[model samples]
Target: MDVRLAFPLSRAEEALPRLQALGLGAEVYLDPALLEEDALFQSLRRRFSGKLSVHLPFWNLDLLSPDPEVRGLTLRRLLFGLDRAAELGADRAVFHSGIPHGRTPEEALERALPLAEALGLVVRRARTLGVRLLLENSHEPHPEALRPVLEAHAGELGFCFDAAHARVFSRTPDPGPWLALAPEHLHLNDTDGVYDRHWNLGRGVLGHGAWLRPYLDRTMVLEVREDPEASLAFLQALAGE
Candidate 1:
């Protein structure tokens, strides 16, 4: 299993060194501000030798926005992410989209599929770079809603399932359907059931370790807001280390 720490670029100076010492992977996040720092990416390349991944900018951008300017900027940010991921020698990169906005469930899925197809056109750019692209769930009722996108893009696109989002946003806590999809990577965190707290394992109501045991072979990121080392320890304990 490739265990890693997921942190914003603001924490990279601290997280990267710690990950190096622990001999683990890293999932570095990027926003427009962080993307501008050439020196930081250079520093990241110099300091880290383990597996690397990137979480592209998602702030205030909607992939399916009816507004052309907003959609253009969203595409720009996504392109920047792929460029940086390739530049940093990252094996994979993760991105997210605005939730499908509709008045009803059936309408949302109807809207989601077309928008995803359009997103795939841009995501296909990763093919040339040999970087795997992952679409992460933000506020979907269930991660299964992303199946259409994954099925359409298969080799070029995969799921980056976020544990907290699954537990908090879904009607049922069952992760079976999503897990069955064989996500390429995971954003592992616990939540209080009602909201996403990004808590460390066992610090919340979600029974993360038990459900996650089967997928330990996949790349997993401790995406908690605090005490990632403790989450790592919990995952290690599950592995009987």
Candidate 2:
């Protein structure tokens, strides 16, 4: 099983030494505002020898915006993020599922049909840069609305499952359906099954130790809000190491 620590871009310099020392990979939050820092990118690449994964900007970026201009801007930012991820030698990149339009789920699907097509361009750009794109589940209670869109992109796009979101925001708080889809990546964090509290593994009620058994072979990013050492130790304990 391969596990990685999630760190914000601003703290990546600090996170590097620990990652190297543990022989673990990193899943970094690549701020769109900081994308132009060429020197920083180079330094990160030079300093980190492990596999890299990028988390694209999620704040205020909407791929399904009704306004074409807004949608274009979102697409542009995504492309820029992909390019930088590649520059940093990242193999996998994750981004939020943009807020869709419409008051009803059915209406939202209809409205998002055309807008979802924009992902083709995003996927092509990622493929060109040798980065695999992953769309993460956010506040959506269920994956029903997302099924069609994800199925459409199939092989070119992949799912990054966030079980915390499901526990807190979902109608059923079940990861079975999402896991049944076979996510390529995972964002593992313990939650109280109520709030978005990013606690260390086994600290909350997510019961990751059991649900995560089958998917241990994939890349699972421990998204504990603080340092990942405690979560790492928890995982080690789960494996009886």
Candidate 3:
């Protein structure tokens, strides 16, 4: 299994060398607000040594925002992420397909089409710059609700299968079928039944080790929120490294 560990860029700089020394590679999440282009690239080049993937900032981004101005801002942020990914030599940039919030699923679908189109353009740009765009499943309660949109863009976009999100939102014990639905640029972590806690693989309620073994041999990123050492140990043990 190609087991890679990932960390938030802001928190992982000093830890990068430590992880590399331990012979592990990483996928890094970059905050658009915190990094400048030159510095970001320098950090990736020097510390990560070209071993990195990225998670674009989508914490408060609303691609399906009803307001045109807000949507435009979201597009700008996403574009910035693409540029950063290219500069840092990242192989993939994972992004979210935003939730409907107060709107019905139908309304969300309507709003999503235009956003998906815009995001498609971003994906093309990333491809031109040699980075793939990975669309992650949402925190919505039903995976079926989001599957249509994902299928619509399956040919053009890749996927980052977020195991914890699937377990939490869909209440599914297994994510195999969900992971199979799209490209498997994965985000492996664990969660409790009620929330997305990002726990170590074996330490959470999700029973990640057994649930993941079927697909663990594929290229996957350990997207845990725990300390890097603990995250690495957990996934290595899960993969029998």
lDDT of each: 0.78, 0.80, 0.70
Q: How close is candidate 3 to the true structure, as a TM-score?
A: 0.85
lDDT value, residue 149 of candidate 1: 70
The candidate with the higher lDDT, 1 or 2, is 2
Native RMSD of candidate 1 (Å): 1.9
Misplaced by over 4 Å in model 3 are 100-112, 171-177
- What does candidate 1's lDDT look like per residue over 1-241, in tens digits? 7998888877788776678666778888885888878998898888778788888888878778789899898888888888898988988888875764222445445556776677875677788788888888766665556777777665667888786776776553677766776787988888888788988888987787668887889999888788677788888899884
Ranking by lDDT: 2, 1, 3
TM-scores of the candidates in the order shown: 0.92, 0.92, 0.85
Single out the weakest 10-residue window by summed lDDT for candidate 1. Answer: 100-109
Q: Name the best candidate (by lDDT).
A: 2
RMSD (Cα, Å) for all candidates, in order, is 1.9, 2.1, 2.6
Candidate 2 on 43-63: residue-level lDDT in tens? 888888777899998787778
